Amino acid sequence: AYDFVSQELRAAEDPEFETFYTKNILLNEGIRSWMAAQDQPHENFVFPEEVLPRGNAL
């Protein structure tokens, strides 16, 4: 039970719709991207710095 399809569609077509649900989705994306490389060493994941998702400044 991962997504609410209607909110995802509206956010895709309207770049001003925002709730806490989308914030949690972004946090999940960050967790996956920054954890997978070392959490599953047998997959030989290689992610260059230019590909890792990140916000401004830090």
Give yes or no for residue 3 binding other proteins (CB under 8 A).
yes
**CB–CB of 29/53 below 8 Å?**
yes
Tokens coding 12 = 């895709």
Give yes or no for residue 12 binding other proteins (CB under 8 A).
yes
Give yes or no for residue 42 binding other proteins (CB under 8 A).
no
Give yes or no for residue 49 binding other proteins (CB under 8 A).
yes
CB neighbour list of residue 18: distance below 8 Å, 6 or more residues apart: 11
- Rule CB under 8 A: which residues touch other proteins? 2-5, 7-27, 29-36, 38-39, 43-44, 46-58
